[PDB]
Amino acid sequence: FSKFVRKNPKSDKFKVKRFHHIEFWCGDATNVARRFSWGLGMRFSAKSDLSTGNMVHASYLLTSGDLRFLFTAPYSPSLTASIPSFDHGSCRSFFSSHGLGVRAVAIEVEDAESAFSISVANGAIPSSPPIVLNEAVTIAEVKLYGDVVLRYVSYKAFLPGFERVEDAFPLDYGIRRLDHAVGNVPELGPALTYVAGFTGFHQFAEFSGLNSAVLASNDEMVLLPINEPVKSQIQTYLEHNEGAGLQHLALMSEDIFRTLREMRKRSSIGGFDFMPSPPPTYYQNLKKRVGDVLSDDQIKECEELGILVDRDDQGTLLQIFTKPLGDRPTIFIEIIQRVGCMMQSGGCGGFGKGNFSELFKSIEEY
């Protein structure tokens, strides 16, 4: 009776691959990284600070699976830098106006020199030219939205100037990669026009107080949703963050029950807090909608963990959200596990849009 048809022109203007890393910018990178390390279960595995010769910034790298979080903070200008786009004047201005937040959204491409030239010839505002690192890595950044940039990394074979680390049954709760990354802007329209203009990402098709549109690369493994405000928590983000900027990171986990039992045990001891949980009638209503996909016990396991379930035409998406990460109510994190389109299709299950109404309906029915 029902059918949902999707288009994919594959209009990528240059060839991209995968999410590479995210770069948090902060004031003291050691504590943000040691916090996030115990909350998310990410192994400290590369660094570039004083003990490595870097007298410009302290950059630490947390890895879990392929997911790579880089934490960067400036030292005193009175004092070698491995990241060629770093600057005290821009980093101090970033953190003053926005607080703890994502500075770069980084994606592996075939060639960063071309990826940047084609971008800038297609409307992209440049933020950092192509710089070859030790004849091994190329790095370039164009403005994405607000003071967030889209960062192109390319190889010929973490980064030059980084040392390795391995010592900590090390930290691993099941997080395996970055699924999608989300910004908020004032006016979605011009933002979609800009971004899709210089990348050729096609709009992804989905099944209160925001309007959402999702860009995807040719393989739809580089997903970028964007939200505009229609009270509206999108509007609250823009005020506290002082402009456009990134809203959440969704982390793909190989077992969302493993990940969640770990991250809820640590909420009150340095880890991360979560949204208050749906009413029990939300989970009583699961069997009627996804009981062909989740066994009763896994349904039990979602109620026991506050885990949201939605599905669209292809598969089913399990998701739960944290509270804000630092001071301001701005950046939160989303933990997701996608089930269904096994080949795994990018975006299997969508992004959770269905849960707004399905959560309202569960509230009303006791």
Added chain:
Amino acid sequence: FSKFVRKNPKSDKFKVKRFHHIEFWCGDATNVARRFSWGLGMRFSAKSDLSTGNMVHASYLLTSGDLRFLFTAPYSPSLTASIPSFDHGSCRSFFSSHGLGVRAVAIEVEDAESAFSISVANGAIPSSPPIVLNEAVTIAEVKLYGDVVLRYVSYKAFLPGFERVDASSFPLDYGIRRLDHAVGNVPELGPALTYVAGFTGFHQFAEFSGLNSAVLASNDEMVLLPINEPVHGKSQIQTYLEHNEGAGLQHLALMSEDIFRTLREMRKRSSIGGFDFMPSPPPTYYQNLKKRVGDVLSDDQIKECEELGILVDRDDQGTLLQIFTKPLGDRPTIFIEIIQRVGCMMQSGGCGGFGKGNFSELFKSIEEY
């Protein structure tokens, strides 16, 4: 046939009680407060942030016994505040230029209204005049060294504005009970002691590498404030001074009712968010312990020091267990000291000293072969 003689003129110019709290100025206090809380074993007790109506700064207060560690970072000017000494321009420049560190070292007093008037009269530079909060508490701040301020907290009989924190069954506790002392790094010791002692009346508490130290003390000798200058000809005092961009607080000793229970808990967490300690002394260091502190510790308590990297020193009055963490933030500046003092029971302040005999004991032990 030796005796160490201590004088105590008890020259306090006002009446001071104990250490009250330490305030770290941050950029994002949530991750620092949470890092410290898991790392030291201190409970979340109060807040003053957006959730409670404060829209100028976020402050999260961690306690553990009597130790009170307050964490404050500024919001955006575009947005209620419970600490009348705060400033966005002051907190930005404090964090741009010194990194994460101590802003204020706060002491309880009979009257902060009078502690300030006397201090300013004897040289001390005023930083925040006395301000009564909800007609219940009074707060004032005079410049200590660099951008540290000495802060006076007097009661009529955590603070006004703070919402008390929620429960998690048996919250964190590794044994830390109070702030023993709060050490400073100055370029010149002389002008340091003259200025501080000139306005506090605190007296030189006598002691039994590349630095010179003098310990300043109130009439009960329970508020302790050692001060350090560098000796040139390398010096960690001088290395502090460059990364900190001037004078500032160098370390906090955290008294613990069982240093082993604290170092067992803390060392378990070093690589899962916690704190890291300096490399442990050679094993000859501890073979030497029997003959200098065997009359105070057992054979099993000298083993527990080795299995833990703990250092032992003693005075004419008592013995001093101590261990040191690596620098708590990005910059190589402020660190934390975990100590527990044995003896001087009536417990006195400055039982066992401050560890100054451990420079040569460590160096002596290092000559293994």
